[PDB]
Amino acid sequence: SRKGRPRKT
Amino acid sequence: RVINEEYKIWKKNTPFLYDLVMTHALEWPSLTAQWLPDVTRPEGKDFSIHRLVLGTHTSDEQNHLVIASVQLPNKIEIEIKINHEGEVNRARYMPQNPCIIATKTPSSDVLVFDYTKHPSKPDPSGECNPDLRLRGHQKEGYGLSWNPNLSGHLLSASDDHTICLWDISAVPKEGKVVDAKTIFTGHTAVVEDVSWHLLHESLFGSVADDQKLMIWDTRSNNTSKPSHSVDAHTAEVNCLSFNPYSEFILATGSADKTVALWDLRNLKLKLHSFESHKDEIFQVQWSPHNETILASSGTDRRLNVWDLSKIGEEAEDGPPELLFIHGGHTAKISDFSWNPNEPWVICSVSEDNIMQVWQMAENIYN
């Protein structure tokens, strides 16, 4: 959707 | 690919394109950004301290509502983290009391926090203990707007096709839940954004996946029919912004890759269409300092700055009204905010965790 899959730094 | 090359050109010309570029990788990405209106300017220092409302967007980890500080010339640090249930879709401070922040969650409830009533360090238990939970929606959303003329009147847009309004000004001290005062049902698809007018306490605009811009009068008893309904774009409309210097003017941004300019006195005809974005636009915001200046961002990883005064001026770089293309991000831009105390400073945040605080070169805007 509008949001992607996030990843931590 | 083309990203790497265009980024290399950007890097090369950065010293001439900017008076300031600061880059910071947040632990998790923020979907939201907004400068708080306060600035402290210490007498024995060559910088001032500004603050930002941010959020987290995690996978399998506690999310937080975040306040960060930024040192700007005349370092970026996290000052407050408040436990938040799910990612922060959007967070906006209340003009009449900027300690009050509303947030949109991945569930239906809209939350309100007064950050002075929470610790600066979050409890590791992870309980989300908002000051208020605002009920009325059936799904998550993005649009969120506080009325600058009616304290505690908040609008929200939802994927449930509705707009909710709450008035939180007279909630009992120990009350923790507020039911919507009014629900507006004019749209026939996901409502993407909502915004109050700056001057008229009863006027707000909404935009939706039905391709329409709607203008609403809160004094009307008919909540299913707006004052005006406008076929605004040829695809989903994701955002809108009212011009804070020109009471009849607003802008919308769309999946059709354009920003449309509108006059409330004649909404049947688009005033102008700004074309340069190569993909879906998610945010549009007028400059807080300059009436003819507007910015837009989205999935093409660009933040464009537009100058209305150059429309129709006398080539391959873009139209004359395109003032600046910020190419510092190499991922979709989620949100951005013009700094209200330092002209031309912008904070923009992208899906790859990057936050940039930047200011184009003085010679570009003269």
Q: Where are the domains of chain B?
A: 1-366
Contact A6 B351 (CB under 8 A): yes
Find which of A1, A5, A9 to mutate to test the B interface (most B CBs within 10 Å of its CB).
A9
The highest-level CATH class for domain B1-366 is mainly beta
Straight-line distance from the first to the last Cα atom of chain A, in angstroms, rounded to the nearest whole number: 23
- By the CB < 8 Å criterion, does B28 face chain A? yes
Task: Give resolution in angstroms.
Answer: 1.9
Contact B353 A9 (CB under 8 A): yes
SS (H, E, C) chain B: CHHHHHHHHHHHHHHHHEEEEEEEECCCCCCCEEEEEEEECCCCCCEEEEEEEEECCCCCCCEEEEEEEEEEECCEEEEEEEEECCCCCEEEEECCEEEEEEEECCCCCEEEEEHHHCCCCCCCCCCCCCCEEEECCCCCCCCEEECCCCCCEEEEECCCCCEEEEECCCCCCCCCEEECCEEECCCCCCEEEEEECCCCCCEEEEEECCCEEEEEECCCCCCCCCCEEEECCCCCEEEEEECCCCCCEEEEEECCCEEEEEECCCCCCCCEEEECCCCCEEEEEECCCCCCEEEEEECCCCEEEEEHHHCCCCCCCCCCCEEEEECCCCCCEEEEEECCCCCCEEEEEECCCEEEEEEECHHHHC
Find which of A1, A3, A7 to mutate to test the B interface (most B CBs within 10 Å of its CB).
A3
Give burial (CB, 10 Å; 0-12/13-18/19+) of B330: middle
DSSP designation for A7: -
Integer Cα distance of B188 and B254 in angstroms:
17
Integer Cα distance of B259 and B339 in angstroms:
21
SS (H, E, C) B219-234: CCCCCCCCCEEEECCC
Question: Which residue's entry shows tokens 């040829």?
Answer: B234
- B285 phi and psi, to 5 degrees? -150, 130
Please say whether the beta carbons of B256 and B234 come within 8 A. Answer: yes
Give burial (CB, 10 Å; 0-12/13-18/19+) of B51: buried
SS3 at position A8? coil
Please say whether the beta carbons of B134 and B111 come within 8 A. Answer: yes
Amino acid at B262: W
Please say whether the beta carbons of B157 and B185 come within 8 A. Answer: no
Please say whether the beta carbons of B323 and B306 come within 8 A. Answer: yes
* Structure determination technique employed: X-ray
Question: Which residue's entry shows tokens 């024995």?
Answer: B44
Q: b/e for B248-269, b at 16 or more Cβ within 10 A?
A: ebbbbbbbbbbbbbbebeebee
Integer Cα distance of B123 and B132 in angstroms:
19
**Cα–Cα nearest to B36, from B48, B24, B46, B47:** B48
DSSP designation for A3: S
Contact B25 A5 (CB under 8 A): no
DSSP β-bridge partners for residue B297: B283, B303
SS3 at position A1? coil
- B183 phi and psi, to 5 degrees? -125, 130
Question: Which residue's entry shows tokens 């939180």?
Answer: B168
SS3 at position A2? coil
Please say whether the beta carbons of B102 and B91 come within 8 A. Answer: yes
Integer Cα distance of B32 and B230 in angstroms:
28
Task: Count CB-CB contacts under 10 A for residue B218.
Answer: 19
Integer Cα distance of B10 and B109 in angstroms:
41
**Cα–Cα nearest to B298, from B252, B259, B335, B347:** B335
Contact A8 B25 (CB under 8 A): no
- By the CB < 8 Å criterion, does B191 face chain A? no
For residue B149, how far is the Cα from the chain centroid? 19
Q: Which residues contact B11 (CB under 8 A, 6 or more apart)?
A: none
